[PDB]
Amino acid sequence: IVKCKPTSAGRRFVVKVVNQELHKGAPYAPLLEKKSKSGGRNNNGRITTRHIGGGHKQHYRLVDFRRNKDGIPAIVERVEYDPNRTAHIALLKYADGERRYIIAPKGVAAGDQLISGIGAPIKAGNSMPLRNIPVGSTVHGIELKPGKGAQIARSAGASAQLVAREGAYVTLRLRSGEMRKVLAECRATLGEVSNSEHSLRSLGKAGATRWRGVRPTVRGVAMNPVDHPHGGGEGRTSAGRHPVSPWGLQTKGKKTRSNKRTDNMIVRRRK
Amino acid sequence: MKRTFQPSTLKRARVHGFRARMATKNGRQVLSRRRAKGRKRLTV
RNA sequence: AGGGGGACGGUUACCACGGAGUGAUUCAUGACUGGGGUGAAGUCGUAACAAGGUAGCCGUAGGGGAACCUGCGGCUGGAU
RNA sequence: AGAGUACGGUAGAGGGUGGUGGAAUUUCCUGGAAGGAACACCAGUGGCGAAGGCGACCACCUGGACUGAUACUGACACUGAGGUGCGAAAGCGUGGGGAGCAAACAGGAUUAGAUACCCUGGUAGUCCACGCCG
RNA sequence: GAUGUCGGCUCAUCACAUCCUGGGGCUGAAGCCGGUCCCAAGGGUAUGGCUGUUCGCCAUUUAAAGUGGUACGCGAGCUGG
RNA sequence: GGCAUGCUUGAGGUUCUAACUCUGGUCCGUAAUCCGGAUCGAGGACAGUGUAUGGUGGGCAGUUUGACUGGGGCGGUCUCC
RNA sequence: CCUUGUCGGGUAAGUUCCGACCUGCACGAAUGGCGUAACGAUGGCGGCGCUGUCUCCACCCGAGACUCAGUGAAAUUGAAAUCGCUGUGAAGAUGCAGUGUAUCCGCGGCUAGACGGAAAGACCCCGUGAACCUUUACUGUAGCUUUGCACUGGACUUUG
RNA sequence: GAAAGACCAAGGGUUCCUGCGCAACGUUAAUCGACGCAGGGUUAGUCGGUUCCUAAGGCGAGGCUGAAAAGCGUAGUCGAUGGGAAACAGGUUAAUAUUCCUGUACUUCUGGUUACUGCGAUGGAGGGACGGAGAAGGCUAGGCCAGCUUGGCGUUGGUUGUCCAAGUUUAAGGUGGUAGGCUGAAAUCUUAGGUAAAUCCGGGGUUUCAAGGCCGAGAGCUGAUGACGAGUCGUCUAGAUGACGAAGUGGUUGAUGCCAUGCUUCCAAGAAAAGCUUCUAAGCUUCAGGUAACCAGGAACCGUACCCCAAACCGACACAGGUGGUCGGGUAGAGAAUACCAAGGCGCUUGAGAGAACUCGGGUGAAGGAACUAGGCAAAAUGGCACCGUAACUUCGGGAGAAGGUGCGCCGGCUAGGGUGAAGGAUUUACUCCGUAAGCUCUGGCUGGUCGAAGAUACCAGGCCGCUGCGACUGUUUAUUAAAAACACAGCACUCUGCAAACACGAAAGUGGACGUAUAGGGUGUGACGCCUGCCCGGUGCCGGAAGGUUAAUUGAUG
């Protein structure tokens, strides 16, 4: 965390997060692949998510969310920057060549770690089935179907706390604040994700948004009646509607979950 | 002050060419209307 | 004849007064304001002095027409 | 002789880091699971530090005095404007936490009225790291 | 099946119910100045500060800073506040 | 009053697997992140879809929104004595 | 709004401006309130310098204008032998009436008229015209949602 | 003269060149033409394409989906604006030339023959293979300065010279391994991986060595005693051609070119695939296949003329417009600005007079100096470099080039260095160090003198200051009357969303969100920052709640 001096009117509010033990260039080439941008656009060519476009060219890193090698110890080579996410990634070298990327946990640099059916818990970074993880311990990178890979708690500094256990399932409080029953056959990694000071950085200037591939938001009271329901009016009007999307869905409080096929898996909502 | 027609023989043939017209059903009947009118070119 | 040497010249430094630009620092004044003092005291009031009718007081944040209340650490200049 | 040191020996909430605790209370739920905070007794007109200050248990890196003497120094002294650090808590920083209470308030009962003491509720805060206020 | 605003600028032209200059009557006109009413249209008849202004209010003039008509004269003359 | 309970039709609950579902693993078609098939796992008679139905619904749509009138609007008026 | 409120400053004089006052027709705290360095082809004021902006224009230099040679358009146009005045008149006349002027025809200029030319008025009214937007107009409807019955089973129980 | 010059892509289509022509076309005339008529003209293993490879994206056997048409898509196979062998100089014409000719190269393929001989995949590895910025340093191209080659000796004073003018050229390729740059290295022992295998790669363990190795711009040769380089001598018709033809060296300064796809640094974290290098599989008779060598032959097809800061393209036009990229000399200069010029190109296809008003684009202006006007609109002014000096306020960066001032040409006198270089000496006897010296070049400091009204003398080149409103800022907007206070924005908050996510496009499959996962994504509002953001939950929305009343299809008691 550094705070830039105001030598120009754009650096006045740039709070920058710089890690000096991140690796200095040349990511691990046999484990990257090509990734082109969508612009938020369908296979019908239609903008289906707005405010997406531009940015920097990026390569996709084949980060392992499954952590399948069991019993084979992996040493950590280096922690790298990943353009595709807000977390860091750690290059692991298994005991038989076999480089892979995982999501880096907090406190890793050249440490040892092994995902298995019964690995050491003290080391944060060991992937493990949710049956034999001790209750009360903070985990991240939780699978949600066995074999599917990690899906939950994998942003920067994200974690979930394993709170209870019964039957074939296991209950864990999520970072969202909601209690979620998850199957105990599926894996999780002990610890907490690495780049937890990511919420401190300030972008500073409008260009810093534009090179993350994010594109400006016209707010709907600035549009015409044909463009948005927040219509027009003379002067600054205030959306005489109730506040609503550009497609007419109400936005300030209205619930939009309608899944029903996974409601029993959610033991308590965001409270 | 550039104008609306900026010529390109590659873009002309991939939008209006013969393979393009006969690739799709709606353009495959452009070529039959334009042949029923008796035109000299039918792909321009 | 002239020379030496003077005198008025020529212009070179020095400088008072004057000029210009931009600042300092002081003095008077200034619509309008904010407290202070002395009065006379009309007024909501009872805030302190008894265990002053909710014990006072001090620092400080915080909050409220007012003479005023809670908290955190503080003191009896606190008494049965 | 004043002042200092070489030698142990205890006494001591010195102070800080990390943990390990317990009951309540609180919050859940079918007696367990969960985490915050101050640690009844030992508590003392007791210790300790220049001062401010400071108590469960545990190690770990560290202070100054006392005293028992034995050694040596040879006034090296005290005080000290300026100068320089260091100073309770509410704070407001710059990041987190989260129980009870509670600054901020809403009403409840009360009075000419509560804006009060009483009654039902809760964020800032105390906690942590660096830093500022002094 | 179009007669395109207000004001300024430029250029005017006519009226007289006269602002100045010229001739007079009456006066509660001593004189200096005036008041009021006749006669008289020859020539003259501001400049600026404010405001988009017409006006107006002000500063300083002048012998005097007149009142009206002319598509509230004038945009195939200008400007465009 | 009713007794035990067989034979059974209505609303619960959690459960069972075999419908269904899986944008999970693994095989095979296959030299394929499609797709089927096989199997393992998960959910499970739920979800989801068809059909019938209540509710919401300017997201979208077809429209309506009178006449009189000393121009139009505002107001008044509109039939009968 | 009243309104150029009132007072102070700036000017010789200031409806603007600055600073105030509070009598806020009709400010107000994320349709954010009040400040704010830097920034601005931003709005309003004031000063220095500078000047043809102006008093008030003078001269000059090039390109048109004018003339000669060659080429050669346009809008418009019922027809024209196409004056002023004062009346009249579908109510502002080259054309009527009365009357004054006035030989015939170009060229250069200037634009007062020809209610000059250009666009079947844009304002306004009209039309049981249109379009597009709005909603708490009417009638619907996509989407979302509720239940019945299908796909859809057994097995005990709480239960009638 | 950073083009009004030379080129390339695109686009056009014969506009190119020559002979004959002038009706029409050409804003006039035309003998001329981008016009008419007829002939001619475009030569490639190396330049561009095809062929090889892929990106976005398109199509898409089967397949999934949909009234139909069709949608989506896997295997696949299309699609360059990217990646993949390789040539340069001088000749030559009316018009083509890296294509023809000459000379010297290079690259790849095929058939041979000879020798010893593990070959082989579309599969595994390696490689190709890459961002932004910023700097040194090494070079070269280019430029500038002499001898004598060569010609000159001046219409007007001087000019046999310390004078004048022109020329002083030469490539790819070989060879060298030159600065510099990256990096340890092989010998062996084995191995849960690179979906089978592997001698390759990856992982783990052992042996010694200071130098391996991989890349890499620059000279001299001789490529090259070659080619190029005024004109004579005579022939033929002032004018072509055959023969001959001279110097060709050195020191300076150098790039925006090359080393360099190098180094340093920063986050926004920076194409794929093939050719290539290598490994084995299924296979082979272990002939075929492989690897060198020698010999012999081959490299198809298509484009090539001309125009491109345009009269040949886009603009109805021989139209002040537009149009991607490349090169870039001299003096002044920071410069690719600008002025004047070189190479090169051009006089813009109506002219001639005349010298009114008025109109346009300028020049100077007495005395005033914003009195103009809606408004300093416009014009005038300021303008460079070095040094001095510089306020409020500030978010400590700024404001600031604030404001204001001084110096400035040319000629000498004196003086401080810096870079290059070598008369010869150290040795690694050479693509090297030390340092002679001069020469050449760059930047000072102090002192005079001198001329004009004036020395950043032209072109070029900020006007400044004081109160204020609004928006924080860079940015964006009504192509064609509005550039703003509007929009965007960083920051802020609210709300939804547990992943087959909310959401969006789709009768649907599917896709986007996202190969992301609550520090994330969508939506709404505010709009840096500082101080803050009061009261109201009735209405309407949303969130939660008992469980009562009313309520739909369905059911079908009873009459």
CSV table of all heavy atoms in Angstrom, one decimal, chain E residues 47-62:
chain,number,residue,atom,x,y,z
E,47,U,P,-25.4,63.0,-29.1
E,47,U,OP1,-24.9,62.6,-30.5
E,47,U,OP2,-26.6,62.4,-28.5
E,47,U,O5',-24.1,62.7,-28.1
E,47,U,C5',-22.9,63.4,-28.3
E,47,U,C4',-22.1,63.4,-27.0
E,47,U,O4',-22.8,64.2,-26.0
E,47,U,C3',-22.0,62.0,-26.3
E,47,U,O3',-21.1,61.2,-26.9
E,47,U,C2',-21.7,62.5,-24.9
E,47,U,O2',-20.3,62.8,-24.8
E,47,U,C1',-22.6,63.7,-24.7
E,47,U,N1,-23.9,63.4,-24.1
E,47,U,C2,-23.9,63.3,-22.7
E,47,U,O2,-22.9,63.5,-22.0
E,47,U,N3,-25.1,63.1,-22.1
E,47,U,C4,-26.3,62.9,-22.8
E,47,U,O4,-27.3,62.7,-22.2
E,47,U,C5,-26.2,63.1,-24.2
E,47,U,C6,-25.0,63.3,-24.8
E,48,G,P,-21.3,59.6,-26.9
E,48,G,OP1,-20.6,58.9,-28.0
E,48,G,OP2,-22.8,59.4,-26.7
E,48,G,O5',-20.7,59.1,-25.5
E,48,G,C5',-21.3,58.3,-24.6
E,48,G,C4',-20.9,58.5,-23.2
E,48,G,O4',-21.3,59.8,-22.8
E,48,G,C3',-21.6,57.6,-22.2
E,48,G,O3',-21.2,56.2,-22.2
E,48,G,C2',-21.5,58.4,-20.9
E,48,G,O2',-20.1,58.5,-20.4
E,48,G,C1',-21.8,59.7,-21.4
E,48,G,N9,-23.3,59.9,-21.5
E,48,G,C8,-24.1,59.9,-22.7
E,48,G,N7,-25.3,60.0,-22.4
E,48,G,C5,-25.4,60.0,-21.1
E,48,G,C6,-26.5,60.1,-20.2
E,48,G,O6,-27.7,60.2,-20.5
E,48,G,N1,-26.2,60.1,-18.9
E,48,G,C2,-24.9,60.1,-18.4
E,48,G,N2,-24.8,60.1,-17.1
E,48,G,N3,-23.9,60.0,-19.2
E,48,G,C4,-24.2,59.9,-20.5
E,49,G,P,-20.2,55.4,-21.3
E,49,G,OP1,-19.0,56.3,-21.0
E,49,G,OP2,-20.0,54.1,-21.9
E,49,G,O5',-20.9,55.3,-19.9
E,49,G,C5',-20.1,55.2,-18.7
E,49,G,C4',-20.8,55.1,-17.5
E,49,G,O4',-21.7,56.3,-17.3
E,49,G,C3',-21.8,54.0,-17.4
E,49,G,O3',-21.2,52.8,-17.2
E,49,G,C2',-22.7,54.5,-16.3
E,49,G,O2',-22.1,54.3,-15.0
E,49,G,C1',-22.8,56.0,-16.6
E,49,G,N9,-24.0,56.3,-17.4
E,49,G,C8,-24.0,56.7,-18.8
E,49,G,N7,-25.2,56.9,-19.2
E,49,G,C5,-26.0,56.8,-18.1
E,49,G,C6,-27.4,56.9,-17.9
E,49,G,O6,-28.2,57.3,-18.7
E,49,G,N1,-27.8,56.6,-16.6
E,49,G,C2,-26.9,56.3,-15.6
E,49,G,N2,-27.5,56.0,-14.4
E,49,G,N3,-25.6,56.1,-15.7
E,49,G,C4,-25.3,56.4,-17.0
E,50,C,P,-21.7,51.5,-18.1
E,50,C,OP1,-20.8,50.4,-17.7
E,50,C,OP2,-21.8,51.9,-19.5
E,50,C,O5',-23.1,51.2,-17.5
E,50,C,C5',-23.2,50.5,-16.3
E,50,C,C4',-24.6,50.5,-15.7
E,50,C,O4',-25.1,51.9,-15.7
E,50,C,C3',-25.7,49.8,-16.5
E,50,C,O3',-25.6,48.4,-16.3
E,50,C,C2',-26.9,50.4,-15.9
E,50,C,O2',-27.1,50.0,-14.6
E,50,C,C1',-26.5,51.9,-15.8
E,50,C,N1,-26.9,52.6,-17.1
E,50,C,C2,-28.2,53.1,-17.2
E,50,C,O2,-29.0,52.8,-16.2
E,50,C,N3,-28.6,53.7,-18.2
E,50,C,C4,-27.8,54.0,-19.2
E,50,C,N4,-28.2,54.6,-20.3
E,50,C,C5,-26.4,53.5,-19.2
E,50,C,C6,-26.1,52.9,-18.1
E,51,U,P,-25.1,47.5,-17.5
E,51,U,OP1,-24.2,46.5,-16.9
E,51,U,OP2,-24.6,48.3,-18.6
E,51,U,O5',-26.4,46.7,-18.0
E,51,U,C5',-27.3,46.2,-17.1
E,51,U,C4',-28.7,46.6,-17.6
E,51,U,O4',-28.9,48.1,-17.6
E,51,U,C3',-29.1,46.2,-19.0
E,51,U,O3',-29.4,44.9,-19.1
E,51,U,C2',-30.3,47.2,-19.3
E,51,U,O2',-31.5,46.7,-18.7
E,51,U,C1',-29.8,48.4,-18.5
E,51,U,N1,-29.2,49.4,-19.4
E,51,U,C2,-30.1,50.3,-20.0
E,51,U,O2,-31.3,50.3,-19.8
E,51,U,N3,-29.6,51.3,-20.8
E,51,U,C4,-28.3,51.4,-21.2
E,51,U,O4,-28.0,52.3,-21.9
E,51,U,C5,-27.4,50.4,-20.6
E,51,U,C6,-27.9,49.5,-19.8
E,52,G,P,-28.7,44.0,-20.2
E,52,G,OP1,-29.4,42.7,-20.3
E,52,G,OP2,-27.2,44.0,-19.9
E,52,G,O5',-28.9,44.8,-21.5
E,52,G,C5',-28.2,44.4,-22.7
E,52,G,C4',-29.1,44.7,-23.9
E,52,G,O4',-30.2,43.7,-24.0
E,52,G,C3',-29.8,46.0,-24.0
E,52,G,O3',-28.9,47.0,-24.5
E,52,G,C2',-31.0,45.7,-24.9
E,52,G,O2',-30.6,45.8,-26.2
E,52,G,C1',-31.3,44.3,-24.5
E,52,G,N9,-32.4,44.2,-23.5
E,52,G,C8,-32.3,44.0,-22.2
E,52,G,N7,-33.5,44.0,-21.6
E,52,G,C5,-34.4,44.2,-22.6
E,52,G,C6,-35.8,44.3,-22.5
E,52,G,O6,-36.5,44.2,-21.6
E,52,G,N1,-36.3,44.6,-23.8
E,52,G,C2,-35.6,44.7,-24.9
E,52,G,N2,-36.3,45.0,-26.0
E,52,G,N3,-34.3,44.6,-25.0
E,52,G,C4,-33.7,44.4,-23.8
E,53,U,P,-28.6,48.3,-23.6
E,53,U,OP1,-28.1,49.4,-24.4
E,53,U,OP2,-27.7,47.8,-22.5
E,53,U,O5',-30.0,48.7,-23.0
E,53,U,C5',-30.7,49.8,-23.5
E,53,U,C4',-31.9,49.4,-24.3
E,53,U,O4',-32.6,48.3,-23.6
E,53,U,C3',-32.9,50.4,-24.5
E,53,U,O3',-32.6,51.4,-25.5
E,53,U,C2',-34.1,49.6,-24.9
E,53,U,O2',-34.1,49.2,-26.3
E,53,U,C1',-33.9,48.3,-24.1
E,53,U,N1,-34.9,48.1,-22.9
E,53,U,C2,-34.6,48.1,-21.6
E,53,U,O2,-33.5,48.3,-21.0
E,53,U,N3,-35.7,47.8,-20.8
E,53,U,C4,-37.0,47.6,-21.1
E,53,U,O4,-37.8,47.4,-20.3
E,53,U,C5,-37.2,47.6,-22.6
E,53,U,C6,-36.1,47.8,-23.4
E,54,U,P,-32.7,52.9,-25.3
E,54,U,OP1,-31.9,53.6,-26.3
E,54,U,OP2,-32.4,53.2,-23.8
E,54,U,O5',-34.2,53.3,-25.5
E,54,U,C5',-34.7,53.2,-26.9
E,54,U,C4',-36.2,53.3,-26.9
E,54,U,O4',-36.8,52.1,-26.5
E,54,U,C3',-36.8,54.4,-26.1
E,54,U,O3',-36.7,55.7,-26.6
E,54,U,C2',-38.3,53.9,-25.9
E,54,U,O2',-39.0,54.3,-27.1
E,54,U,C1',-38.1,52.4,-25.9
E,54,U,N1,-38.1,51.9,-24.5
E,54,U,C2,-39.3,51.6,-24.0
E,54,U,O2,-40.4,51.8,-24.6
E,54,U,N3,-39.3,51.1,-22.7
E,54,U,C4,-38.2,50.8,-21.9
E,54,U,O4,-38.3,50.4,-20.8
E,54,U,C5,-37.0,51.1,-22.6
E,54,U,C6,-37.0,51.6,-23.8
E,55,C,P,-35.8,56.8,-25.9
E,55,C,OP1,-36.1,58.1,-26.5
E,55,C,OP2,-34.4,56.3,-25.8
E,55,C,O5',-36.5,56.8,-24.4
E,55,C,C5',-37.7,57.5,-24.2
E,55,C,C4',-38.5,56.9,-23.1
E,55,C,O4',-38.3,55.5,-23.0
E,55,C,C3',-38.3,57.4,-21.7
E,55,C,O3',-38.9,58.6,-21.4
E,55,C,C2',-38.9,56.2,-20.9
E,55,C,O2',-40.4,56.3,-20.9
E,55,C,C1',-38.5,55.0,-21.7
E,55,C,N1,-37.3,54.3,-21.2
E,55,C,C2,-37.4,53.6,-20.0
E,55,C,O2,-38.5,53.4,-19.4
E,55,C,N3,-36.3,52.9,-19.6
E,55,C,C4,-35.1,53.1,-20.2
E,55,C,N4,-34.1,52.4,-19.7
E,55,C,C5,-35.0,53.8,-21.4
E,55,C,C6,-36.1,54.4,-21.8
E,56,G,P,-38.1,59.7,-20.6
E,56,G,OP1,-39.1,60.8,-20.2
E,56,G,OP2,-36.9,60.1,-21.3
E,56,G,O5',-37.7,59.0,-19.2
E,56,G,C5',-38.7,58.7,-18.2
E,56,G,C4',-38.1,57.7,-17.2
E,56,G,O4',-37.6,56.6,-17.9
E,56,G,C3',-37.0,58.2,-16.4
E,56,G,O3',-37.4,59.1,-15.3
E,56,G,C2',-36.3,56.9,-15.9
E,56,G,O2',-37.1,56.3,-14.9
E,56,G,C1',-36.5,56.1,-17.2
E,56,G,N9,-35.3,56.1,-18.1
E,56,G,C8,-35.3,56.7,-19.3
E,56,G,N7,-34.1,56.6,-19.9
E,56,G,C5,-33.4,55.9,-19.0
E,56,G,C6,-32.0,55.4,-19.1
E,56,G,O6,-31.2,55.6,-20.0
E,56,G,N1,-31.6,54.7,-18.0
E,56,G,C2,-32.4,54.5,-16.9
E,56,G,N2,-31.8,53.8,-15.9
E,56,G,N3,-33.7,54.9,-16.8
E,56,G,C4,-34.1,55.6,-17.9
E,57,C,P,-36.6,60.4,-15.0
E,57,C,OP1,-37.6,61.5,-14.8
E,57,C,OP2,-35.6,60.6,-16.1
E,57,C,O5',-35.8,60.2,-13.7
E,57,C,C5',-36.1,59.0,-12.9
E,57,C,C4',-34.9,58.4,-12.4
E,57,C,O4',-34.4,57.4,-13.3
E,57,C,C3',-33.7,59.3,-12.2
E,57,C,O3',-33.8,60.1,-11.0
E,57,C,C2',-32.5,58.4,-12.2
E,57,C,O2',-32.3,57.7,-11.0
E,57,C,C1',-32.9,57.4,-13.3
E,57,C,N1,-32.4,57.7,-14.6
E,57,C,C2,-31.1,57.2,-14.9
E,57,C,O2,-30.5,56.5,-14.1
E,57,C,N3,-30.6,57.4,-16.2
E,57,C,C4,-31.3,58.1,-17.0
E,57,C,N4,-30.8,58.3,-18.2
E,57,C,C5,-32.6,58.7,-16.7
E,57,C,C6,-33.1,58.4,-15.5
E,58,C,P,-33.1,61.5,-10.8
E,58,C,OP1,-33.7,62.2,-9.7
E,58,C,OP2,-33.0,62.1,-12.1
E,58,C,O5',-31.6,61.1,-10.3
E,58,C,C5',-30.5,61.9,-10.7
E,58,C,C4',-29.3,61.0,-11.0
E,58,C,O4',-29.6,60.0,-12.0
E,58,C,C3',-28.1,61.8,-11.5
E,58,C,O3',-27.4,62.5,-10.6
E,58,C,C2',-27.4,60.7,-12.2
E,58,C,O2',-26.6,59.9,-11.3
E,58,C,C1',-28.5,59.9,-12.8
E,58,C,N1,-28.9,60.3,-14.2
E,58,C,C2,-28.0,60.0,-15.3
E,58,C,O2,-27.0,59.4,-15.1
E,58,C,N3,-28.4,60.3,-16.5
E,58,C,C4,-29.5,61.0,-16.7
E,58,C,N4,-29.8,61.3,-18.0
E,58,C,C5,-30.4,61.3,-15.7
E,58,C,C6,-30.0,60.9,-14.5
E,59,A,P,-27.1,64.1,-10.8
E,59,A,OP1,-27.0,64.7,-9.5
E,59,A,OP2,-28.2,64.5,-11.8
E,59,A,O5',-25.8,64.1,-11.6
E,59,A,C5',-24.6,63.6,-11.0
E,59,A,C4',-23.5,63.5,-11.9
E,59,A,O4',-23.8,62.5,-12.9
E,59,A,C3',-23.2,64.7,-12.8
E,59,A,O3',-22.4,65.7,-12.1
E,59,A,C2',-22.5,64.2,-14.0
E,59,A,O2',-21.2,63.9,-13.7
E,59,A,C1',-23.3,62.9,-14.2
E,59,A,N9,-24.4,63.0,-15.1
E,59,A,C8,-25.7,63.0,-14.8
E,59,A,N7,-26.5,63.1,-15.8
E,59,A,C5,-25.7,63.2,-16.9
E,59,A,C6,-25.9,63.4,-18.3
E,59,A,N6,-27.1,63.5,-18.8
E,59,A,N1,-24.8,63.5,-19.1
E,59,A,C2,-23.6,63.5,-18.5
E,59,A,N3,-23.3,63.3,-17.2
E,59,A,C4,-24.4,63.2,-16.5
E,60,U,P,-22.9,67.2,-12.0
E,60,U,OP1,-22.1,67.9,-10.9
E,60,U,OP2,-24.4,67.2,-12.0
E,60,U,O5',-22.4,67.8,-13.4
E,60,U,C5',-21.1,67.9,-13.7
E,60,U,C4',-20.8,67.9,-15.1
E,60,U,O4',-21.4,66.8,-15.7
E,60,U,C3',-21.4,69.1,-15.9
E,60,U,O3',-20.6,70.3,-15.9
E,60,U,C2',-21.4,68.5,-17.3
E,60,U,O2',-20.1,68.5,-17.9
E,60,U,C1',-21.8,67.1,-17.1
E,60,U,N1,-23.3,66.9,-17.2
E,60,U,C2,-23.9,66.9,-18.4
E,60,U,O2,-23.3,67.0,-19.5
E,60,U,N3,-25.2,66.7,-18.4
E,60,U,C4,-26.1,66.6,-17.4
E,60,U,O4,-27.3,66.5,-17.5
E,60,U,C5,-25.4,66.7,-16.1
E,60,U,C6,-24.1,66.8,-16.0
E,61,U,P,-21.4,71.7,-16.0
E,61,U,OP1,-20.3,72.7,-16.1
E,61,U,OP2,-22.3,71.8,-14.9
E,61,U,O5',-22.2,71.6,-17.3
E,61,U,C5',-21.9,72.5,-18.4
E,61,U,C4',-21.9,71.8,-19.7
E,61,U,O4',-22.6,70.5,-19.7
E,61,U,C3',-22.5,72.5,-20.9
E,61,U,O3',-21.6,73.5,-21.4
E,61,U,C2',-22.9,71.4,-21.9
E,61,U,O2',-21.8,71.1,-22.6
E,61,U,C1',-23.2,70.3,-20.9
E,61,U,N1,-24.7,70.1,-20.7
E,61,U,C2,-25.6,69.8,-21.7
E,61,U,O2,-25.3,69.6,-22.9
E,61,U,N3,-26.9,69.7,-21.3
E,61,U,C4,-27.4,69.8,-20.1
E,61,U,O4,-28.6,69.7,-19.9
E,61,U,C5,-26.4,70.2,-19.1
E,61,U,C6,-25.2,70.3,-19.4
E,62,U,P,-22.0,75.0,-21.4
E,62,U,OP1,-20.9,75.8,-21.9
E,62,U,OP2,-22.6,75.3,-20.1
E,62,U,O5',-23.2,75.1,-22.5
E,62,U,C5',-22.9,74.8,-23.9
E,62,U,C4',-24.2,74.6,-24.6
E,62,U,O4',-24.9,73.5,-24.1
E,62,U,C3',-25.2,75.7,-24.6
E,62,U,O3',-24.9,76.8,-25.4
E,62,U,C2',-26.5,75.0,-24.9
E,62,U,O2',-26.6,74.8,-26.3
E,62,U,C1',-26.3,73.6,-24.3
E,62,U,N1,-27.0,73.5,-23.0
E,62,U,C2,-28.3,73.1,-23.0
E,62,U,O2,-28.9,72.8,-24.0
E,62,U,N3,-28.9,73.0,-21.7
E,62,U,C4,-28.3,73.3,-20.5
E,62,U,O4,-28.9,73.2,-19.5
E,62,U,C5,-26.9,73.8,-20.6
E,62,U,C6,-26.4,73.9,-21.8
